[PDB]
Amino acid sequence: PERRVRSTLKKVFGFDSFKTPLQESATMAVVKGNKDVFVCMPTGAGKSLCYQLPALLAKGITIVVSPLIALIQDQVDHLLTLKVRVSSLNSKLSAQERKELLADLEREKPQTKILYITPEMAASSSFQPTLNSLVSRHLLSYLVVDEAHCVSQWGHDFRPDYLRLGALRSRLGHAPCVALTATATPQVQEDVFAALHLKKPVAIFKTPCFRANLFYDVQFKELISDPYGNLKDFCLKALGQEADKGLSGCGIVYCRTREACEQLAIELSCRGVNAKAYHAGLKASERTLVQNDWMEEKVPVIVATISFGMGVDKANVRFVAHWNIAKSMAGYYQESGRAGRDGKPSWCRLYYSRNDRDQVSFLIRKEVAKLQEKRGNKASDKATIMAFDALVTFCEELGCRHAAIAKYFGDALPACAKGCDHCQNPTAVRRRLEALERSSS
Amino acid sequence: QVQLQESGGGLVQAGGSLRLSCAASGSIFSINRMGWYRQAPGKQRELVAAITSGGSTNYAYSVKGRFTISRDNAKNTVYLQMNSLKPEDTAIYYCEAYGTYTLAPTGEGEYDDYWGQGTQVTVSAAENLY
Ligand SMILES: [Zn+2]
Fold this sequence. Notes:
The complex is a heterodimer of chains A (about 450) and B (about 130).
Chain A: H1 2-11, H2 21-32, E1 37-40, H3 47-57, E2 61-65, H4 69-81, E3 86-89, H5 95-106, E4 114-117, H6 119-123, H7 128-136, E5 140-145, H8 165-171, E6 177-181, H9 186-195, E7 202-206, E8 214-220, H10 227-238, E9 250-254, H11 258-270, E10 275-278, H12 284-296, E11 301-304, E12 317-322, H13 329-336, E13 346-352, H14 354-374, H15 379-396, H16 401-409, H17 421-424, H18 426-438
Parallel strand pairs in A: 1-6, 1-7, 2-4, 2-5, 3-4, 5-6, 8-13, 9-11, 9-12, 10-11, 12-13
Helix pairs in contact in A: 1-3, 2-3, 14-15
Chain B: E1 3-7, E2 12-13, E3 18-25, E4 28-39, E5 46-52, E6 57-59, E7 67-72, E8 77-82, E9 91-103, E10 108-115, E11 119-121, E12 123-124
Parallel strand pairs in B: 2-12
Antiparallel strand pairs in B: 1-3, 3-8, 4-5, 4-9, 5-6, 7-8, 9-10, 9-11
Zinc ion binds near residues 402, 419 and 422 of chain A.
């Protein structure tokens, strides 16, 4: 039962329990082997186990399609280290090594338990006979498609080779199919389900966006006589939630330009919020000192471009403020999400200005056209624009900010708990929008 | 899993008007297409009309101009306004919630088609009341 999974989880993978109860649910569902499955969890969160552990228990071969060799290699190497009968088929292999593997799979009892293949080979006429014999001889326990989103033109990583995978899934009729990715909008999820020919009911395990402890709000810079003061007050309120620790935690302010970073750090510092600018314009030495002081809590606020990265994670970020609207909802989600990792209350705020909206909308269109002269027209170009439009919608609409985010990503309506501006005071937001409408001209 | 209930099907005079309302309930994030199918007795089931998320409609030739499909995306409800009914329109009518995306506040979801039990529509040619 569940017992076999736990033991094989320890006896092979050396783990007491699954990272999450969701990862557990996903794995168990793949184990039952009745349903096609879709896993949309982030990088980390242990998606691989969701198909690897069940691949072992299966009494047959698991094929795994992955788009490039780096991804394949990481795991095969690690599966070997667990004394697990894994193999890779790719054209970066010698013709004889290939011939040898193909022969293995043709044998009544093949060595291979897990075969990683590229989409190219999986479609190739040179591999269909092998695949046919595995199907005929009922030796195939799972078809797995990693980076499933690559099938979608509305995705950011489209690969025509992935379109052929659908016809293939149909051929491997009996056997369950598992599709995995870190990132799919509802439109991408639809393209995956359809283009991979997943058999309904498709069982879905998707890590929710929602974070209780983050308080989201938007302010309109055009409706504010002291913007710098508004920001100061915001940073101070976010810091010093515990008079016991005095001024407690740290904060990020994001700006589009390096000039804005420099200038805004001054405005804040002068008003009594100690802030230093971080951008690629600074000398390496300067950057390492600013980062250090922020990390070591000598300087509570960093004013940064997108150059500040998930590479540095800090638990006690009490606020992220976007002085300028982000290029994309996914960017805003990622950037604002640097807040509150320790679980304690934090504040995410976006400073919206139609002058900003237009400045960015222009910048995107200009560097999309720069691509169209180089590579020509593409469906990804339209998704780039759609990605920004979602965030403009997020600002200029009224409704739970967390729900708007859940909707974009394809999550359930989340449990807001007066945890965004709109849910706390729907009226103020209405008033503020109305106000921006008068200030429209 | 989802609950579809079709309603508003009844015996009608020739030239009568019927409205078929089906409500989809569950943790429904979205429905690719809500559609009305009908099955006359000992005849094979056929598409009467369907409407996508986005409002693209699609109708059988024989009901074009007489029948109008419409949807309330937020209530997950589809409607079929049937006008100028004929005896040939007599059948059991089924509603298909096609591509129905379900999701808990945990990441646990499903993607499936759902169907209703059906609602009987009988159209009598008789000239006078009963
Ligand atoms: Zn809210």
